[PDB]
Nucleic acid binder design. Sequence first.
DNA 1: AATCATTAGCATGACAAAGAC
DNA 2: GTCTTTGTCATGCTAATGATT
Lengths: 127, 77
Amino acid sequence: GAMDMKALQKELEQFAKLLKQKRITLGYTQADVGLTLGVLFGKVFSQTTISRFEALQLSLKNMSKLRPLLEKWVEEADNNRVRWSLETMFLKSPKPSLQQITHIANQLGLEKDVVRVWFSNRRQKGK
Amino acid sequence: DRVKRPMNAFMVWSRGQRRKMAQENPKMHNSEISKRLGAEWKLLSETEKRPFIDEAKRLRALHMKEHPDYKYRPRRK
DNA sequence: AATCATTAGCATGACAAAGAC
DNA sequence: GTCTTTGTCATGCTAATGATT
């Protein structure tokens, strides 16, 4: 509820500020932090998601998921054309047949998975 | 009064090298000095860069102390 | 195994120095 | 304000993944 929300919000505004101060006094870039999460858990994050964590522009669910990994980080540190083709199929067949999907994947040198996902992302783009 | 961004390793190094390359080639435009400093920096070894990397680290830390509430706010077109 | 909402990164661009133009 | 560079941080768009069917 609302009480759990305000409290979780204040907790992260506060941790994000610690994370920023610690990475700066230790001489790390945002990039370095993302890369070094990768070394210590085998799970890389991009400079971008570190920029968004520190500015509180990720979702509170997203911040909560990432905060433990970052607290562990703090601890250790202290010791086109293809699109054109896909658009024209979308226009003729928005939800495509499984066979059509495979054809266009081998035709454009993609796998099925990418193709089916592309169509889903495009369907959701109607607003 | 406006708070500038802190100076990254290359830019720290490029200050002193720019001055020396201007002295060696007094007609050279700053535009051309810059291309030459880029090329020289790409060639420096990791050991040769370290003093400049640590100075940039040090200046980022100080930047925070001087300007606790600083956020980089670039102007979009 | 298949939708919809959400997470995440790639590409991009600003801006730090210098001063001649 | 523009040429010019590397490195760092911010952001717009969309590929990818998670949650829930």
